[PDB]
Structure 1
Amino acid sequence: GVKVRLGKEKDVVRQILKKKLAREGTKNPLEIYSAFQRDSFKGHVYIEARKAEAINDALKGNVNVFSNNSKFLVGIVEYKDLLRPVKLTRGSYVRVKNGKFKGDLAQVDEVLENGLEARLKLVPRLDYGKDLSYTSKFRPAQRLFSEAEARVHEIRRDRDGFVTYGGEEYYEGFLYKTFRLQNLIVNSINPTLNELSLF
């Protein structure tokens, strides 16, 4: 393992590959086999070789590497634990990570075929067009969609209990909106006092 500047781990892995490929077949090949960097392990690149001198060779001149002779040996019994790769079932709850709904609890109603996105059921934050001629810091308080309020103040019926209002879909008072899976938190979610009162 080698200590590198935080955020520069992928760059160092890249740079090592360029050096390896450029020196292949020459009289001075870079005698490393592989190098990698795990996100979970901030500021540390791992380099595979037979001699320590090759590690120094791989990193020579690299501006992202700390000059102190800090290269540490990994035990064979710890190799596999370096390359470990690692829910969201329908009807389960996730927390939204982006937009006016950031931080809100939502039910994962549907999942996109390609697998890229999904569809979440969430308590809307609407104004019924009241001041039209949004951000997470200047958003509106959460409340179920009221179609008669929309009818009165500002609306397309689609189905039983389903309305499209300002180009978003509301079914039985809930917004159904697609979010990237990478924009939703599925792990260690702690329901709040307010969420226990509601759901």
Structure 2
Amino acid sequence: IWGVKVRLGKEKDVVRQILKKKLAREGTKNPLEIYSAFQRDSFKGHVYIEARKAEAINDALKGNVNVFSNNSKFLVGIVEYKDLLRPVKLTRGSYVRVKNGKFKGDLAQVDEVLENGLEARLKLVPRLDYGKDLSYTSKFRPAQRLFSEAEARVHEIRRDRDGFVTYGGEEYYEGFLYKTFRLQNLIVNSINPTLNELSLFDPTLNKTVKIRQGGYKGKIGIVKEANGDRFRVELHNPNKTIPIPCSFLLIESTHGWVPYED
């Protein structure tokens, strides 16, 4: 058995291509003298090929666009063969982490599994809004909080049993969502409970002004700053903001420019 380096993600394609070549050449004068070929997911970027002569390995891969042209094949020891073909949990009452949907990343208890053996019913702390803005994603979801049936009663619900309600077509029993997930959609290994899981389980600014005394008499402006007695008017006419005393200003109101009786 030789290993061969191939383009990442193209290992299954190379195994396929080798099979087509083998079957197409069976019984001809130039058979492909390989016995088998395979690719292990755990071993990214490699295909393994079974034969008697190295030349057959080169023959199997000739012209394959997914294989690195460098003469990189390597020999496997007989004592390493079976480990290449090693094929490899989940119990009711145990915890898993959800891998998809608004509950992605959340800890859940395994309640039960389907007869066929694919999806598992999970007990989950819900993330609900009680229909508050109706007329969901994992990035725009809700905080987790146990289902409250009286809140649902008040705001937006079918009773099914003691402590069991169907609310918006999902089932909540004693405050928890019970929802089926594909087993492939949950993580059962190396779960690390989090901290949180251990805990749980002046009236004239900006108004337009006219100046009635001084060298700037008759000009429009806006009150930029009115700290005290001395105002800052941003004059319109030249690009300058001036310091000015409060006796000098007329303010606009409902009827004309009004003195300091506004």
Cα distance, 1:142 vs structure 2: 0.1
Cα distance in 1, alignment partners of residues 188 and 81 from structure 2: 29
Q: Which is bigger in relative contact order (C-alpha 8 A, separation at least 6)?
A: 1
User: Can you give the 5+ residue segments of structure 1 that lack an aligned partner in the other structure?
Assistant: none
Q: 1:147 maps to what in 2? A: 149
Q: CA RMSD in A?
A: 0.2
Q: Deviations over 1:115-167 (max 9, x none)?
A: 01110000000000000000000000000000000000000000000000000
Cα distance in 2, alignment partners of residues 53 and 104 from structure 1: 53
Q: 2:132 maps to what in 1? A: 130
Pick one of 35, 45, 57 that aligns with 1:33.
Answer: 35
* Structure 1 counterpart SS, 2:128: coil
Q: Deviations over 1:41-84 (max 9, x none)?
A: 00000000000000000000000000000000000000000000
Cα distance, 1:5 vs structure 2: 0.0
Q: 2:200 maps to what in 1? A: 198
The structure where strand makes up a greater share of residues is 2
Cα distance, 1:88 vs structure 2: 0.8
Cα distance in 2, alignment partners of residues 130 and 71 from structure 1: 62
Cα distance in 2, alignment partners of residues 170 and 162 from structure 1: 6
Cα distance in 1, alignment partners of residues 131 and 70 from structure 2: 61
Q: 2:241 maps to what in 1? A: none
Q: 2:23 maps to what in 1? A: 21
* Structure 2 counterpart SS, 1:107: strand
Cα distance in 2, alignment partners of residues 94 and 5 from structure 1: 34
Query: Structure 1 runs of 4+ off > 4 angstroms?
Result: none
TM-score by length of 2: 0.76
Cα distance in 2, alignment partners of residues 104 and 189 from structure 1: 11
Cα distance in 1, alignment partners of residues 41 and 120 from structure 2: 25
Q: 2:65 maps to what in 1? A: 63
Q: Deviations over 1:175-198 (max 9, x none)?
A: 000000000000000000000000
Q: 2:234 maps to what in 1? A: none
Cα distance in 2, alignment partners of residues 37 and 83 from structure 1: 9
Cα distance, 1:87 vs structure 2: 1.6
Cα distance in 2, alignment partners of residues 158 and 71 from structure 1: 64
Q: Which has the larger radius of gyration?
A: 2
Q: 2:107 maps to what in 1? A: 105
Identity rate, percent: 100
* Structure 1 counterpart SS, 2:181: coil
Cα distance, 1:10 vs structure 2: 0.0
* Structure 2 counterpart SS, 1:197: helix
The structure where helix makes up a greater share of residues is 1
Cα distance in 1, alignment partners of residues 136 and 145 from structure 2: 16
